[PDB]
């Protein structure tokens, strides 16, 4: 769904056609200008940060596994006459439709019996999913995965790719997969009984020598060596695949270019009228394509256990009964060919749509994790209250699109309630502390991180405990579309806090909200302050994340209640503007303004520049030549948003109906 | 009748087409949120179970035996001209109709004489019944039956499959039956005198190679090895079967799929004009598709002796008189094709219609068994007063439909008073003791159950004496639509147990009604209560079921005087998500509230999900409006043009609609 | 075939029965792949003009041309100026204005693709052999690429890219009879024609 | 801005080429383009004294098309305004004050 994911990008940013990705890691952000103004009891001070880079990091590494499941049928592309006055498939009219379009009327009773059983299981989403993955393996087939490389690196702790991904070796993306080929047989017209558990698809003219090899490899098993996002393990779709081609198919060549895969997809969709089936596969890949690099070491807990990708079962009966597919197809929405027309024009745009989607999900799960398990809307019952359709199960895409609705605060709508794709909320839905394996870089590691072994040596491999899951990403593209108090991602804001009395060289902050505001100010001024949690006896630091220049309360790494002892004597000066002061006095007022946003992308510690021309808009209106909006709002999936209502605690988040 | 069985299903239940059954046991039910409360002089203790599963276990096994009986003729199908004003065959118009036809002139006088006997032989219910069973045998053929498997187990008493079903070998449903084929001869139109005691049917065009194999096996003896419900014992319907098909009958193929049986049925109903015959066969199979696993150990008395199935004799004389069947048939009700049209569209919906019917019957036979013989509407005379027709004998479908009418509280209407199918009320009407076999687990069994021995070592085969039949199923689909105080299936309920501090926990229940509600609500709260009768000296436990989680008064297994001593310092916490009664003092007040309902099904201790399209309420009007429409768009290939439009680039072309 | 005729004439075609029998033409189009047509060479300077597989080929050799986009197989003659498009430019009256200054020594660069097509076409009616050279790629195009219609379509370039056509107007050669001469132009040129009667 | 195909942007028009190199000079980016007709390299940093670009620095009267090298854009003088990668329609609005 192009028009949906295209809306998530910020109004100022309009990306160009091509993007030459040449690495397994891409930073994306913006260069903003901050105009700070400070006032306290001592006096006033005015400064200005001329260039500030706020960015996340996203990679092509994510452990996933495929399962074949049975899902709903997509009834789009079938002729409009077999459907009655309502949006329902009548078997009374299928008998009539097949009868009028043949001379041999002996086969009508047999044809109707088989058609009735097959039409209620038609889904080509799993075939297009694999065909799309083959396109990007050939295009970006020079990305290197080194086993003894770094995953996260702060200075105290470190995670290698040996950990998080065991049973892996060093390989390029083209060298990862060695796909076998399934038998692409020809369906001779005259066969009366459709062979069971084998799909048949239509084709335009002669099946090319290259088109055979693509369809053969798309249906086969995926068995990777290196952990890659677009080369994840998938079960075998089918053994055979019939093709009702008037001209006979040619034998498989063995080799194909990425350009040849586009020609295979464009023909397969046009012949079968499977435009809505492609839209499902497009959204399903937008989830998988890229995975987040964690903000802090604790945010690696999300990516330990392998998330399951629900691939629908491959079934189709267009090859057997080509009478059912004619020139007047049935569609629910009039904008039902937009997603394919967008991809075929601008293939590399999927990267930006993928980054936009996975950001929105992992940002909002930062809030859902902090919700107490004694309210109406909680981690267990947030999807069920949101959805207003009838899917098979609240899994895959339904979970992800619910989180996008909660982020943007708008009603998202799909034509069919499809439940296919990655489920992320697995690490969240379990009342157990997660054991992230880490490497010790400095001797003073146990003071900061909640480590098992309290005495360590540089080189030792230990384990750290994570109870509450912290935010994996900060808002960048979705910055200021709706501002929560937790992130505090405002354009303009006036922070007011009262400074605690400095007894010896230490200031006690008993309250939780005041402590968050204090360290948030001192960070924007650019003062590396270090405080001691009195309950646990572990040191917290506002400079936790360098990439995103902000302080979240989850950097304390202790759910519950505590009091902090801030060290006011050892306040280091890392980055100093003219605003920056060391000695606060009385009531601290900081008023900042953010202006002059401009998007910038970094890859392999150099600037990554966009190539090609400017993207012209392709989009169809609500009506072509349709008079009355026959609402048909019974079967269509609808996802209602939730607004965060702030309360006194500040540690707990709460959702309400707007 | 699809219509009346559809209304039995709950409002929240939204069924889909396909149901992938892969076992011989299904736990259908619903998930509800129970808000329990315990109020006392000391204070209130609140609990909340967010997902409480109330289930009824249903199996695919059950001993049945078919017998060929004489039943009324179904006159729906014959041309409307030969019928008089009253609605009976006016012989004289038959002789007129045969004379003005394409019949051989020398046969008219001899055939007209036979008409008086042969035209009143119209009942195809037996053939359609067997052909429906062949459809489901080949569809769900992979289900297994093990000999030494657990039929029932409640901890104390165990009942194996060897006990109830001797002469039983372990085998799959597909490998159970080995059906021999009956002769399908071609009717010679130039036959001198019609052969009575040999049925002759009509057919459209040519009898296919697979249709011969299906009709051959349908009119044959069912001799099963494993006691399956859809493969029970049936006698040989007929030896030979004539088929008036001018196009010759092809010889038997040998093999056929489940889709080929649907092809055979749709041709047979259409040619013979026998839709009311199919409606009778649909309701027959709805009774005897699935049998309920007994709720308690002593509720196995219903399934000891084999209940007889009444199959009406196969008799059809359409082959001899082709002229009398045409396109203008005589029918009583206008909605006479609705039952077939429903089955062809949604075959797997019969499973839901079957469980709805047996749950309605076995619930009502529960509270019919607890009435004294000295009454107006009693055990023996509940069918006679309800029935306002003229059936041959009050058996089969009449006894099952009258029990459904009592449950729902509505008027059930059928077009013909047909008396065919299973008779359930067999063990009830006998009014004698039934001896169910049991294998013991513990050594302290015969205190609880009314056993034949008083001391029994573990692993011994004993006998339980059941006098009054307890309810076999708890109401789940029919929950709080026609509520009785016996089952106590309310949304809101409360009980007030009155105790004084002078009593050291010990309470005596003089009333029987509130004893039942106390013991039931304590089990929702997850507390194992063990009462002891003061008069007799037996013991009862509220934990006497692992499906519904309720206490019915028939679990006492004795009718006498009511003096139940419950000691409230021996209450043990058994389940999870439970409220604690540590030490009560004064008057106790228990209460619960069920708020929302969600349909759930379980199989092999895993969730069984419904897949496929959205099932609609098919009406007679929804198809015949498309017949009124006719697709009246004159079938004329009108090709509309597209004017090319030039813009800035001129290299690429752009087409407009006008 | 009937739906293509409906687009050409711009009318509604009606048949009594929706019959689907006859030849299907749209075969090579829908494939959307490269087609390898065989050719026997005459001259030795062939592969500059045509997108050939070899760069040096001796005369009488059997080579292959790579065709990506399908050029028009026929020019409109019976359907001339009934439903006119700017691609074919099948007007009765037409004109083009090529703007040059005396400081330029005959050399003109066509930034626009549309008026380059009309200039090269009208010069062929006037019987002048013009040979343009693309500045970006470095290939050559000749207006004399047909002996039937006598017009220049833009698909005769045999390449889709950026438009920078250098035409040197002191290498124009008079080829045909009944021709107007461009001996030595100075300033703005204005070409025009008029078709009056048809037989 | 012209579409950057490989690492080269073709400027067919004369006026647009003058405005492009005039902007990049004020930002302070030493851009070098190749004249396709002559085959000689033009540079916007021709005169250091006067900080502006005139069209006569091409040194070819007549008509031509320029191939601008977008990969080899050096950074001689950088203010905070100065960017290397232009995208779409470029707008530059400057004000001159405080003459002495």
Residue numbers in the entry:
A (entry chain B), B (entry chain A): 1 to 658
C (entry chain A): 400 to 598
D (entry chain B): 499 to 598
Give sentences from the paper.
L-BC virus persists in the budding yeast Saccharomyces cerevisiae, whereas other viruses from the family Totiviridae infect a diverse group of organisms including protists, fungi, arthropods, and vertebrates. Totiviridae is a family of viruses with monopartite double-stranded RNA (dsRNA) genomes, which contain two open reading frames encoding the capsid protein and the RNA-dependent RNA-polymerase (RdRp). The capsid of L-BC is organized with icosahedral symmetry with two subunits of capsid protein, named A and B, forming the icosahedral asymmetric unit. Decamers of capsid proteins are stabilized by domain swapping of the C-termini of subunits located around icosahedral fivefold axes.
Two-dimensional classification of particle images from a purified L-BC virus sample identified 87% empty particles, 9% open particles, and 4% genome-containing virions. The structure of the empty particle was determined to a resolution of 2.9 Å, whereas those of open particles and virions to 10 and 3.7 Å, respectively. dProtein geometry was refined against the reconstruction of the empty particle. However, the purified L-BC sample contained 87% empty particles and only 4% virions. This indicates that during the sample preparation, the fraction of empty particles was enriched or the genome release was induced. The observed particle damage could have been induced by the freeze-thaw cycle required for sample shipping or the low ionic strength of the buffer (20 mM Tris-HCl pH 7.5, 50 mM KCl, 10 mM MgCl2) used during particle vitrification. The alpha-helical cores of L-BC A and B subunits have nearly identical structures, which can be superimposed with RMSD of 0.6 Å. The strand βU of the A1 subunit is inserted between the strands βJ and βK of the A2 subunit related by 72° counterclockwise rotation when looking from the inside of the particle. These strand insertions between adjacent A subunits propagate around the fivefold symmetry axis and may stabilize the decamer structure. Salt bridges at two positions stabilize the domain swap between A subunits.
